[PDB]
Amino acid sequence: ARTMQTARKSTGGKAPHRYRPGTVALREIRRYQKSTELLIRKLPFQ
Amino acid sequence: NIQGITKPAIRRLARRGGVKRISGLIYEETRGVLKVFLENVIRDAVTYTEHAKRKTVTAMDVVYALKRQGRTLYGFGG
C-alpha cells in the first residue's frame, strides 16, 4: 500500500421566542381599531 | 386622582389612534392636555347647572357644554 511509497507520497484518499419590536404594537393597533369599548377606566375617571 | 390614567391607559389610547412608538414624556403631556380639556368642558357644564339652579349636573349639561365647545356628541339625549 501507500506505506511503501518512499517518494511522491500519494495523499489522495486519506486525511422562549420573542417577537421583533413593533409587531405586538401594530397588532394592538389592529385590535383596538376594530373595537369601540372604552379604554380609560371608569372609576379613576369618575 | 390625575395619576389614575397612566401606563397602559395612555398606551391603549395611542393604539386606537395608530401610534407605534411612544416616548416617555407623552404620558405627562397627555394628562395636561386632558386636564385642560376637562376643565373647559366641565366649566361650561357647571355654568348651565348654576343657571338652572341645581346641585346635580345632568347628562344634558355635559352634552350642551360639548355643543358649545364644538364637540357635538350623539347618544346621551336629544
From Swiss-Prot, chain B:
Residues found modified as N6-glutaryllysine: K7, K35, K53, K55, K67
Q: Which residues carry this modification: Phosphotyrosine?
A: Y27, Y64
Provide the positions where the record notes the PTM N6-(2-hydroxyisobutyryl)lysine.
Answer: K7, K20, K35, K53, K55, K67
The N6-lactoyllysine modification is found at: K7, K53, K67
Positions of modified residues (N6-succinyllysine): K7, K53, K67
Any one GO biological process: nucleosome assembly
Provide the leader sequence positions. none
Residues bearing PTM N6-butyryllysine: K7, K20, K53, K55, K67
Keyword Acetylation in the entry? The reply is: yes
Q: PTM Phosphoserine: at which residues? A: S23
The answer to whether UniProt assigns keyword Lipid metabolism to this entry is no
One Gene Ontology molecular-function label: structural constituent of chromatin
Q: Where is this cross-link: Glycyl lysine isopeptide (Lys-Gly) (interchain with G-Cter in UFM1)?
A: K7
How does it get modified after it is made? Demethylation is performed by JMJD6. Monomethylation is performed by KMT5A/SET8. Trimethylation is performed by KMT5B and KMT5C and induces gene silencing.
Cross-linked residues for Glycyl lysine isopeptide (Lys-Gly) (interchain with G-Cter in ubiquitin) are K67
Instruction: Kindly list the positions at which N6-propionyllysine occurs in this protein.
Output: K7, K20, K53, K55, K67
GO CC entries:
nucleosome; nucleus
Give the source's domain of life in one word.
Eukaryota
- N6-acetyllysine occurs at K7, K35, K55, K67
Name where it's found: Nucleus; Chromosome
The UniProt keywords, alphabetically, are: Acetylation, Chromosome, Citrullination, DNA-binding, Hydroxylation, Isopeptide bond, Methylation, Nucleosome core, Nucleus, Phosphoprotein, Ubl conjugation
- Provide the family line: Belongs to the histone H4 family.
Q: What does this protein do?
A: Core component of nucleosome. Nucleosomes wrap and compact DNA into chromatin, limiting DNA accessibility to the cellular machineries which require DNA as a template. Histones thereby play a central role in transcription regulation, DNA repair, DNA replication and chromosomal stability. DNA accessibility is regulated via a complex set of post-translational modifications of histones, also called histone code, and nucleosome remodeling.
Q: How does it assemble?
A: The nucleosome is a histone octamer containing two molecules each of H2A, H2B, H3 and H4 assembled in one H3-H4 heterotetramer and two H2A-H2B heterodimers. The octamer wraps approximately 147 bp of DNA.
Record protein name field: Histone H4
